[PDB]
Amino acid sequence: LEDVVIDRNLLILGKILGEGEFGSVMEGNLKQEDGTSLKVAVKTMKLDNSSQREIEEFLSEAACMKDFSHPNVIRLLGVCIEMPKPMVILPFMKYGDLHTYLLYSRLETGPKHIPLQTLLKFMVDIALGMEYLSNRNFLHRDLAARNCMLRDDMTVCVADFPVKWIAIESLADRVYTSKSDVWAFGVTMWEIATRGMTPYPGVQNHEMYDYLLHGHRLKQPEDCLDELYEIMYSCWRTDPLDRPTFSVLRLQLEKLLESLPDV
Amino acid sequence: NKLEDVVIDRNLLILGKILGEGEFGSVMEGNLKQEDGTSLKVAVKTMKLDNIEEFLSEAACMKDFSHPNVIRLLGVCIEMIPKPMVILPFMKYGDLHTYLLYSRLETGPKHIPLQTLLKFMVDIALGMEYLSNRNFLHRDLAARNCMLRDDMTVCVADFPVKWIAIESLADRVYTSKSDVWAFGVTMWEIATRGMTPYPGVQNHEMYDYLLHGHRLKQPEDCLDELYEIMYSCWRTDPLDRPTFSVLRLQLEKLLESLPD
Ligand SMILES: CN(C)Cc1cccc(-c2c(-c3cnn(C)c3)oc3ncnc(Oc4ccc(NC(=O)c5cn(C)n(-c6ccc(F)cc6)c5=O)cc4)c23)c1
Ligand SMILES: CN(C)Cc1cccc(-c2c(-c3cnn(C)c3)oc3ncnc(Oc4ccc(NC(=O)c5cn(C)n(-c6ccc(F)cc6)c5=O)cc4)c23)c1
């Protein structure tokens, strides 16, 4: 390990961009190899320090996360050790998460009304990032629009900072395969096609399993294309193996998006 | 002493399944046997109070209301260990907030035209005008607390820091001008068809966000004059805010000024 470690001195921690319970995310400046300072985000992570199963998996996840390279996967820039607390350094993205962005578009003073085409490109991007991740047998386990970042070029990159995003096979059985990510991708798709509606309006959290096991699914949004909804519906098939892979979904959406005219 | 005039004997009521549940109280469907032998579908909210006279006097004055845009009180039951329960007519079309979300789905109710959305607002103002003229304080105004009568008119009912006026955040002060503020937010909920107030702004950020002069932002395809009305509800000084009677007439002009 430690090929992903940056000397603490190199990191200036600013204000908190959001506080959770097992971690906080702050803005920061990283002094790079070439003298320049990059704007970074820094997630302070609280591990179970009674053992090392959290720590040793922590460095080890970042270990191969560093070796990732994909425009639709957020880049790990490194980790810091402060004494003890670990913290993960990613490039800052002024455009924030996609979920918040979808809500902002609904405001006259916010970004322009997102055309259907851009929404599709949003989902193409996420699928590209997921295809890369699954073709390396990497399981995300928190896919949602709140976990998708907007790079400065307005492309989307997958990240990982929720019962309504969890696949029915994962709620009763404790399991998570790539097909489970695919299910969350369907909800993420629906979260995007609705421009930020909470999944399953009128259904409570504790009723999710009963709702899903009786065979009910997320509902076609008011003006969602029929082809687009059948793609997202295939993500929720009762049996994990009957669902498509991210590679297959990525090309369905690419084909659907190119069927539409421009902007 | 007119408690009785409001109370309904327990044996006239049959409790069904849950419509919704809260820690303070849960709501169940019900059948109420009436004066004329017919049974009416009712909602039944059960209230738990630590060891009531107050409760039994709210229902008293609350029964004395009659506005078509206010939900009506049919009676009260007391079941035994006190277990008070409040009986209101059942409305199959549910709450306005959930209904707004349903409009956005193909299978749910058709896309609500701006004029109908305006009527939803007009209806709520009519119910607030009635209640404020009686010098009642709602204190929980929000699209979730508005019911859809079977005639698709809206009534005001009473089952949230983003619906609380800035003067009521600082103090525990609350006046009808505070409800005017929540009505503005409710107007915004309806204009947005169920969005959560202040996207990207956190519950704890709110008082600071409001104290710096920021307000809920104009929805994308919402009329400039409709937004002027809901903005006036958010003025820093409660006295500069309009009354529910003024708001009610503002909305009515806007609706009539629009084509049909
Ligand atoms: C929702 N909003 C309102 C609140 C909010 C809350 C928090 C941050 C941001 C935010 C903003 C931002 C705020 N306002 N605005 C206008 C923009 O900008 C940003 N730019 C970049 N990142 C940001 O937050 C992130 C922090 C961490 C990660 N982390 C990952 O993706 C990981 C993948 N892995 C494998 N690991 C890992 C896990 C275990 C290990 F051991 C090792 C690595 C990871 O840690 C991703 C994003 C932000 C916004
Ligand atoms: C998302 N969904 C599930 C949310 C939801 C949740 C629960 C019920 C309903 C629901 C449904 C319905 C349709 N579909 N589904 C699926 C459900 O239909 C309904 N019809 C009628 N009411 C309903 O809920 C109400 C119950 C009580 C009151 N209460 C009042 O209005 C009071 C005014 N006052 C002064 N007092 C008071 C206060 C103190 C006192 F001491 C005395 C009196 C009051 O108690 C208002 C509404 C429903 C919808």
Residue numbers in the entry:
A (entry chain A): 577 to 659, 665 to 742, 763 to 864
B (entry chain B): 575 to 625, 631 to 659, 664 to 742, 763 to 863
What does the paper say about this structure?
MerTK, a TAM receptor, regulates macrophage efferocytosis and polarization, and its inhibition holds potential for tumor growth suppression and immune modulation. Additionally, MerTK plays a prominent role in regulating efferocytosis, the process by which macrophages engulf and clear apoptotic cells. MerTK is activated upon binding to its ligands, Protein S or growth arrest-specific 6 (GAS6), which recognize phosphatidylserine (PtdSer) exposed on the surface of apoptotic cell debris. In this study, we present a novel strategy for designing MerTK-selective inhibitors by modulating the conformational dynamics of its αC helix.
Since 11 demonstrates highest selectivity with SI of 46.1 among these synthesized inhibitors, the cocrystal structure of MerTK in complex with 11 was resolved to investigate its binding mechanism and molecular basis of the selectivity. The headgroup of 11 orients upward to target the αC helix, while the N,N-dimethylethanamine moiety forms a salt bridge with D678 in the hinge region. This upward binding of 11 contrasts with the previously resolved structures1 and 6which exhibit a downward orientation that extends into the allosteric pocket. Furthermore, the upward positioning of 11 allows the 1-fluorobenzene moiety to form hydrophobic interactions with F634 and A638 on the αC helix and V669 on the β-sheet. Additionally, the para-fluorine of 1-fluorobenzene forms a C–F···O interaction with F634. The acetamide linker forms a hydrogen bond with the backbone of D741, locking MerTK in a DFG-out conformation. Moreover, upon the binding to 11, αC helix of MerTK becomes more stable and adopts an outward conformation in both monomers whereas αC helix is more dynamic and adopts two different conformations upon the binding to 1 or 6. The electron density is also clear and more continuous for αC helix, adjacent β3-αC loop and P-loop, indicating 11 stabilizes αC helix and its surrounding areas. However, in the MerTK/11 structure, the introduction of the longer N,N-dimethylethanamine substitution on Ring-6 results in the shift of adjacent DFG motif to accommodate this longer tail. The differential stabilization of the αC helix by 11 in MerTK versus Tyro3 is consistent with their respective inhibitory effects, with IC50 values of 21.5 nM for MerTK and 991.3 nM for Tyro3. These findings suggest that the selectivity of 11 for MerTK over Tyro3 is attributed to its interactions with and stabilization of the αC helix of MerTK.
